[PDB]
Design an enzyme around this catalytic site. Structure first.
Site, short mmCIF file in Angstrom:
data_model
loop_
_atom_site.label_atom_id
_atom_site.label_comp_id
_atom_site.label_asym_id
_atom_site.label_seq_id
_atom_site.Cartn_x
_atom_site.Cartn_y
_atom_site.Cartn_z
N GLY A 1 -37.00 -1.78 -10.16
CA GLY A 1 -36.96 -3.33 -10.74
C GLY A 1 -35.78 -3.79 -10.69
N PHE B 1 -29.56 -8.91 -14.62
CA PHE B 1 -28.66 -8.04 -15.42
C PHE B 1 -28.73 -6.58 -15.23
CE2 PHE B 1 -30.16 -11.86 -17.53
CZ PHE B 1 -31.78 -11.69 -17.85
N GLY C 1 -33.69 -7.53 -12.32
CA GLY C 1 -33.33 -8.73 -12.85
C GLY C 1 -32.03 -8.99 -12.49
N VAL D 1 -32.81 -1.16 -11.91
CA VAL D 1 -33.17 0.22 -12.17
C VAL D 1 -33.55 1.04 -10.98
CG1 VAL D 1 -35.03 1.63 -13.58
CG2 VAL D 1 -34.13 -0.51 -14.47
N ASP E 1 -36.84 -6.75 -29.42
CA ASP E 1 -37.58 -7.01 -28.30
C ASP E 1 -38.83 -5.91 -28.25
OD1 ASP E 1 -38.84 -9.03 -26.67
OD2 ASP E 1 -37.90 -8.03 -25.05
C1 LIG Z 1 -29.47 -3.22 -26.14
C2 LIG Z 1 -30.24 -2.83 -26.91
C3 LIG Z 1 -29.85 -2.76 -28.63
N1 LIG Z 1 -31.31 -4.14 -27.17
C4 LIG Z 1 -31.21 -1.64 -26.41
C5 LIG Z 1 -31.29 -1.30 -25.08
C6 LIG Z 1 -32.04 -0.24 -24.92
N2 LIG Z 1 -32.16 0.13 -23.69
C7 LIG Z 1 -32.91 0.83 -22.85
O1 LIG Z 1 -33.64 1.77 -23.50
C8 LIG Z 1 -32.76 1.01 -21.38
C9 LIG Z 1 -31.66 2.16 -20.89
C10 LIG Z 1 -31.30 2.10 -19.47
C11 LIG Z 1 -32.59 2.42 -18.93
C12 LIG Z 1 -32.56 2.93 -17.55
C13 LIG Z 1 -33.86 3.28 -16.70
C14 LIG Z 1 -34.93 2.67 -17.25
O2 LIG Z 1 -36.19 2.88 -16.66
C15 LIG Z 1 -36.85 4.04 -16.65
C16 LIG Z 1 -36.54 5.02 -17.81
C17 LIG Z 1 -37.34 6.19 -17.92
N3 LIG Z 1 -38.58 6.30 -17.40
C18 LIG Z 1 -38.73 5.43 -16.10
C19 LIG Z 1 -38.01 4.28 -16.14
C20 LIG Z 1 -38.63 3.47 -14.91
C21 LIG Z 1 -40.15 3.31 -14.74
C22 LIG Z 1 -40.67 4.67 -14.87
O3 LIG Z 1 -41.58 4.95 -14.21
N4 LIG Z 1 -39.86 5.58 -15.36
C23 LIG Z 1 -35.06 2.24 -18.55
C24 LIG Z 1 -33.93 2.03 -19.31
C25 LIG Z 1 -33.88 1.36 -20.72
C26 LIG Z 1 -32.59 0.65 -25.84
C27 LIG Z 1 -32.52 0.22 -26.97
C28 LIG Z 1 -33.29 1.00 -28.34
F1 LIG Z 1 -33.12 2.21 -27.76
F2 LIG Z 1 -32.74 1.26 -29.57
F3 LIG Z 1 -34.40 0.53 -28.43
C29 LIG Z 1 -31.61 -0.81 -27.68
#
Ligand SMILES: CC(C)(N)c1cc(NC(=O)[C@H]2CCc3ccc(Oc4ccnc5c4CCC(=O)N5)cc3C2)cc(C(F)(F)F)c1
Ligand SMILES: CC(C)(N)c1cc(NC(=O)[C@H]2CCc3ccc(Oc4ccnc5c4CCC(=O)N5)cc3C2)cc(C(F)(F)F)c1
Lengths: 253, 262
Positions: free
Chosen positions: B16, B20, B18, B23, B128
């Site tokens: 994906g 921002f 966006g 991925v 969110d």
């Molecule tokens: C900035 C703030 C405070 N709002 C915040 C951001 C995040 N950000 C994340 O969780 C990001 C991290 C980077 C990242 C990278 C790759 C990604 O895509 C993945 C990951 C794992 N598996 C898969 C996929 C793709 C789709 C599949 O099939 N598998 C997902 C994400 C998610 C978490 C939190 C929390 F943990 F506190 F809730 C809080």
């Protein structure tokens, strides 16, 4: 900092006790595992061993490494990890004799080598890899750890007697490879522990590679021998070990 | 330190993208997930958002929280987390329409509650929480994150999980532990109904206006009947329009861990 605030962790059922520590299942934001030191006053050697384990685990963050979550110094020394559902690879192979199929044994091999590679990249030498320290989470995911609370996995230079190295872990992994492909421990026909220590140490004894499942691919059998090479230097490092399983995993299923 | 040694990450498939970031499914000591910027040089306010995300993720070590593995700045700003097989809760519920069992539906909530309790304790507001951000790794483990774009977009920013105080978009910061609770209460609704709230309305602005003034509220009578009484009662508590009449996550978790063994 990863210190868990005081009075949060509720210790539940008692899992396993050892001469040093004791493990309990517990509750901290769900199910957790707790390794406690049950002493009224810890010695400097106990305190230091605690600080090592924590120091190490805080440098790990990988699906094939048992997930570290925190520690508590008061009231008693404790290490908190995730709670895993399943058994050790030791349990599956030697106790409840789980008959995995070839594809799955290789996936276990890969995953174990996957996590081992991770540890070595960060200058962490396991020092005690064995099927018992390989927990099979949900009978799916390898989670390497030290569930310690011995000899079949010790390379010659470790038995002759700091002799631990990246290569000493590869030998242990080699023995784990043997367990997977045979389903049995090495030297099962010898019933005298002290003699094994003597023999493997001198190169008189080697795991009998002939006992591998008939359907174990030749590429696996050849990798196994490489890992069990009596001389340190001849043994492959984990990047090469992984590459070899990943090439083999390709043309098989 | 969690900076990944320079140039070890191989970026593969594209999932994906966006505005921002993008991925990717990558490789670093096995299969991993990578989110990175695709600009030449990041702005000052993009570098900050990167630093916050890493600031937060570094503080999390929980089974139900998506596992942060490391980050990289050279060649590009990138965040590496574990790869998860399967799809979000949103996909299972509203796209493929998996008919889950009640025991499992409760488990799915029990884990999300576990995860949220953890974040709140570490003083982290999610801001969110939605069924899109509830990934179901290997169809049996809830991994909470902010998958913005790595998963399918919600029916309508996403509005359905916002509490009244949040939608009114008052200049004073409305985000609290309780606003996350409300979102959880809507996720619960999603689990118990198999449906999204306000499905009979087709105007986005009306939904916004009405949830904010408290003229609209989710229709509780839509729940499964094999759904426990103790669950409905809780789901109503979490959605109570009054901010601080809503249970915090420790009490929520206890209530789900109560009826779970009966
Ligand atoms: C900035 C703030 C405070 N709002 C915040 C951001 C995040 N950000 C994340 O969780 C990001 C991290 C980077 C990242 C990278 C790759 C990604 O895509 C993945 C990951 C794992 N598996 C898969 C996929 C793709 C789709 C599949 O099939 N598998 C997902 C994400 C998610 C978490 C939190 C929390 F943990 F506190 F809730 C809080
Ligand atoms: C000292 C040093 C450097 N050699 C070293 C120690 C460790 N120590 C650990 O891994 C400990 C940590 C504390 C801890 C706590 C609970 C525990 O027991 C669990 C965990 C999860 N699930 C279960 C159980 C019980 C039995 C069940 O049924 N489930 C296990 C452990 C293992 C790891 C490493 C490694 F990372 F290099 F591998 C290196």
């Amino acid at each position: 900092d990863w210190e868990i605030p005081d009075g949060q962790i509720t210790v539940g059922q008692r899992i396993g006790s050892g001469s040093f520590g004791t493990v309990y299942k517990g509750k901290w934001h769900g199910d957790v595992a707790v390794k406690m030191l049950n002493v009224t006053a810890p010695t400097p050697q106990q305190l230091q061993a605690f600080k090592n384990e924590v120091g190490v685990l805080r440098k790990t963050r990988h699906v094939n490494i048992l997930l570290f979550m925190g520690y508590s110094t008061k009231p008693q020394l404790a290490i908190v990890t995730q709670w895993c559902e399943g058994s050790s690879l030791y349990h599956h192979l030697h106790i409840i004799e789980t008959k995995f199929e070839m594809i799955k044994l290789i996936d276990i091999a890969r995953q174990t080598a996957q996590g081992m590679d991770y540890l070595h990249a960060k200058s962490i030498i396991h020092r005690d890899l064995k099927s018992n320290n390989i927990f099979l989470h949900e009978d799916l995911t390898v989670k390497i750890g030290d569930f310690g609370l011995s000899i079949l996995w010790m390379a010659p230079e470790v038995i002759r007697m700091n002799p631990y190295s990246f290569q000493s872990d590869v030998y242990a992994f080699g023995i784990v490879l043997y367990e997977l492909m045979t389903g049995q421990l090495p030297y099962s026909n010898i019933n005298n522990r002290d003699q094994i220590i003597f023999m493997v140490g001198r190169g008189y004894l080697s795991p009998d590679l002939s006992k591998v499942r008939s359907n174990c691919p030749k590429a696996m059998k050849r990798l196994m021998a490489e890992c069990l090479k009596k001389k340190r230097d001849e043994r492959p490092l984990f990047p090469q070990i992984l590459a070899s399983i990943e090439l083999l995993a390709r043309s098989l299923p």
